[PDB]
C-alpha cells in the first residue's frame, strides 16, 4: 500500500501522544486530588486531634 507511510506513522505518533497527554493531564490531576486528599484529611485529622487539648 505504497506510501502515506511517513504521514501514516506520524499521524500515529500524533494521536498516540494526544491520548497520552489527555491521560497524563489525568495523571497529574490524580497527583493533585487524592494527593490533595492525603493532605486535606491529614490536616483535618490534625485539627481534630488538636481539638482535644
Amino acid at each position: 500500500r505504497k506510501k502515506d507511510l511517513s504521514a501514516i506513522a506520524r499521524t500515529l505518533q500524533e494521536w498516540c501522544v494526544g491520548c497520552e497527554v489527555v491521560l497524563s493531564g489525568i495523571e497529574e490531576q490524580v497527583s493533585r486530588a487524592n494527593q490533595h486528599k492525603e493532605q486535606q484529611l491529614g490536616l483535618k485529622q490534625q485539627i481534630e486531634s488538636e481539638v482535644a487539648n
Binding site: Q29, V30, A33, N34, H36, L41
Partner: peptide, 14 residues
C-alpha cells in the same frame, strides 16, 4: 470523567 474520579476519591478516600 477525571475530575469525577477526583471527587470520588475525595468522598470515598476523603
Amino acid at each position: 470523567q477525571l475530575a469525577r474520579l477526583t471527587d470520588y476519591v475525595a468522598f470515598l478516600e476523603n
